[PDB]
Design a protein around this ligand. Sequence first.
Ligand SMILES: Nc1ncnc2c1ncn2[C@@H]1O[C@H](COP(=O)(O)OP(=O)(O)O)[C@@H](O)[C@H]1O
Ligand SMILES: [NH3+]Cc1cc(-c2ccccc2)no1
Ligand code: NA
Length: 266
Amino acid sequence: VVEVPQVTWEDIGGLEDVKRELQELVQYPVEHPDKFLKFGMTPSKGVLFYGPPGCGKTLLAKAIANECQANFISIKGPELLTSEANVREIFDKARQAAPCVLFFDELDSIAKAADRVINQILTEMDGMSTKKNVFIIGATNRPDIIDPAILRPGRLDQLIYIPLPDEKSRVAILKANLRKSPVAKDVDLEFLAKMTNGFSGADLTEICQRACKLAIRESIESEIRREREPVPEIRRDHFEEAMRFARRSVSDNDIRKYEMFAQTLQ
Ligand SMILES: Nc1ncnc2c1ncn2[C@@H]1O[C@H](COP(=O)(O)OP(=O)(O)O)[C@@H](O)[C@H]1O
Ligand SMILES: [NH3+]Cc1cc(-c2ccccc2)no1
Ligand code: NA
């Protein structure tokens, strides 16, 4: 289905630098059109996100569309395999749905015939102007096998690193996930951030989801019993129990590889 996503910047913990860069990348064409006319700037057509899984690349693509009040179309890389006109029809539908964000997920899978489902993608991008109001976003978990042809000017304009959350970011992710939940006052999220070094954003969300379930199942059972004869909260002890099916999903070795890739691009 095609729709404007509900996720906002507020749902995304950390990545504050990345967020104002993306805002500037899309707010500037419509907030200062006179200066965009004055100097000859063409709006950006695309970005490529990279980093470990579960750290917010999909969330950021949906928040960009929500900011622009734009439709969102998602395509996972493995599913363009049956048929090179598959690529042509997706760009048609995105153009039909303009203004629109077109998100290519799991692009590392086609980075490994398939040789130019790629060329088709590259040609569709070259043949589409910024006047069509379609903004393209790709995401990958394997930045080592990016064909640099997709980063040439006129295609995806910027490669952007989306890293594992640091300690400050882990507090923000917990707070964003819990922003509309009733959390007991004995819950110390800064201490939970201290104890989750190396956790991804998806890893943190599971802890919150397990603690919230445990609370619901407590609420269910206690009213079942009080029947035999006041909004409840997620308490510290629900979080205590959730945290021992809690472990990192990204290895220390993959973390080293991402950090090396990113640090060498300064
Ligand atoms: N920065 C973040 N802030 C808040 N939640 C996050 C963040 N990163 C990941 N999550 C949680 O993990 C889930 C997966 O994130 P996603 O953006 O799909 O990861 P990927 O980087 O693999 O695209 C999200 O739905 C959300 O619950
Ligand atoms: N097993 C997953 C995996 C990840 C990587 C990798 C390679 C380069 C940079 C970052 C990550 N190589 O393999
Ligand atoms: Na990923």
